[PDB]
Amino acid sequence: KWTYFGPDGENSWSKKYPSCGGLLQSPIDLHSDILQYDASLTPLEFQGYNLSANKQFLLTNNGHSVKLNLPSDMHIQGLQSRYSATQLHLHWGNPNDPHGSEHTVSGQHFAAELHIVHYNSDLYPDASTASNKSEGLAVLAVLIEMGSFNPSYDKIFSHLQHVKYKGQEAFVPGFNIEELLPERTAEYYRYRGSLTTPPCNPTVLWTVFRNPVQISQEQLLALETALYCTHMDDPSPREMINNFRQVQKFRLVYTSFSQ
Amino acid sequence: WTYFGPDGENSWSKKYPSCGGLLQSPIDLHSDILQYDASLTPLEFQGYNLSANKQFLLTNNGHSVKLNLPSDMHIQGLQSRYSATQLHLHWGNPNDPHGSEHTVSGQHFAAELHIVHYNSDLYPDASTASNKSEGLAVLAVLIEMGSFNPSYDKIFSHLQHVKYKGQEAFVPGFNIEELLPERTAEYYRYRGSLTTPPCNPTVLWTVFRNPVQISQEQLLALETALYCTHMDDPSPREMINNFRQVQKFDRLVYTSFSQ
Ligand SMILES: NS(=O)(=O)c1c(F)c(NC2CCCCCCC2)c(S(=O)(=O)CCCO)c(N2CCCCC2)c1F
Ligand SMILES: NS(=O)(=O)c1c(F)c(NC2CCCCCCC2)c(S(=O)(=O)CCCO)c(N2CCCCC2)c1F
Ligand SMILES: [Zn+2]
Ligand SMILES: [Zn+2]
């Protein structure tokens, strides 16, 4: 129904998905003129993130990105409701332009971005029900840049070889998802926004950590070159690249750090 | 169509199919998509010194302010002669005075001037040209906050007479080349589109490398003088943030400079 490229690309999402042309759209450029320090923004607590290595979690190529299913016993503590995990997934660019984060900082894209999606389990019974409702979603965003090899990210990336094509799936043994978060999680940007893909509902409480994580040049290249958005038997195969939405016009972004 | 709300830029494709098509402008000018082209030679600006005995219509059309230009103003150096039709501006707002259309290495400038031309070797007028490939050529000048600019003030001194949609004022001829920056020989060149509906992908863009300056007071005037609504409208709407977000570009921008 929708794509990141071509005639069904992001400027056309609003035809079928009205909220994509509505208010509170994400992602955004995090820059000085729209920030405000909020001393009340305390560190979140990440509970249940240490997933048992005896359990397995489904990784799927759905044609738009790769996503890992997460159990609802994982949750964020510190918001007005409990938010319980549902999935994590990534957004990236391409080897010729390896700058495919969704959020930018002072107009700069990072190489990639990880989103850990949660739903308000105090108010709603599941993520689908929560997704178009008040206070329904909370997403944690980790900016990713090129640097040292990252063994924790490789716990996902080592499986990309088995989800090359749309509709393919692989089981990933549990590991500590907190390993994917950066140093100093206390420093973050906080704002009310939306899903960054259709249906673009304006129901997401975003937390974008200030500090990026690093993955190696080779890990980033693998992420950018391993996957296809087409089924294996498609006579017109299409590489899965540039699967991020452009920044949206933006209204205040609160920061847990004063400078 | 508008730049904010239900008829804003993510909705333009609902009515204007080209706004969701290929070759859309503006774009972020950054290293990964740039290629030096030693063959790109300086444009020559012919007829830009408009007679002071003549006058040129300035119009608030509800989306920006535009100044009509005569077809005896020409650019030489492209594959055809292109003749002027108008100039106009794009800007931000006082709380976020960063409303250029093009960005450079992810940074918005305060505003941007467009001087629109059409291929007069092939087409009799800009309307005809606008639907034809490379029918149009636009010169873009990036504008930053700095010194007072007496040349731009030859346009800005009139803003208080075109405050509302449909209002018009005459501007005596002056040297339009005074609106251009230093070292016009240095520029970015790419094939793109109109940045407003109908978004036709028919524009040869030239973005000069170097910005010009206007003062904080001049920028504030440009950001606060104009309304998108008619004078008698019971709910006035300020004309601010009348720039399109940057578009995906994955394709090369050629530069006339290497360093
Ligand atoms: N970037 S984002 O964090 O906004 C965000 C989400 F949040 C959710 N998941 C949400 C919660 C679970 C499903 C219920 C409906 C809301 C989607 C999802 S999703 O898997 O559920 C797809 C449906 C929405 O397009 C995605 N995708 C986009 C397609 C590629 C994989 C990740 C997304 F990018
Ligand atoms: N940013 S841009 O340079 O792409 C660009 C153009 F080029 C043209 N003028 C072109 C040539 C003259 C008229 C023929 C049709 C194509 C528009 C125009 S225009 O006046 O002709 C309006 C066309 C609306 O469909 C505009 N506007 C947008 C609204 C505010 C004033 C300037 C524009 F922003
Ligand atoms: Zn996402
Ligand atoms: Zn313009």
Numbering used by the authors:
A (entry chain B): 3 to 252, 255 to 263
B (entry chain A): 4 to 253, 255 to 263
What does the literature reporting this entry say, word for word?
The role of carbonic anhydrase isozyme IX (CAIX) in tumor cell survival, proliferation, migration, pH regulation, and cell-signaling pathways made this enzyme a promising therapeutic target in oncology. , Tumor cells primarily express two membrane-associated carbonic anhydrases, CAIX and CAXII. These isozymes belong to a family of zinc metalloenzymes that catalyze the reversible hydration of CO2 to form HCO3 – and H+. Although the active site is characterized by conserved amino acids between 12 isozymes, the amino acids further away from the zinc ion provide some variability.
In all subunits, the ligand adopts a consistent binding mode, with variability in the cyclooctylamino and piperidinyl rings. Additionally, the para-tail hydroxyl group shows positional variability, as it is exposed to solvent. The meta-piperidinyl group in compound 10 is well-stabilized and tightly packed against the hydrophilic cavity wall, with all conformations being similar. However, there is no direct interaction between this meta-substituent of the ligand and the protein. The sulfoxide linker of the para-tail is stabilized by a hydrogen bond with N64 and Q89, except in CAXII-10, where N64 is too distant for interaction, but in one subunit 3.4 Å hydrogen bond is still possible. Interestingly, despite the bulkiness of synthesized di-meta-substituted compounds 10, 13, and 14, especially the first one compound 10, which possesses large piperidinyl and cyclooctylamino groups, ligands acquire quite similar binding poses in the soaked and cocrystallized complexes with CAXII.
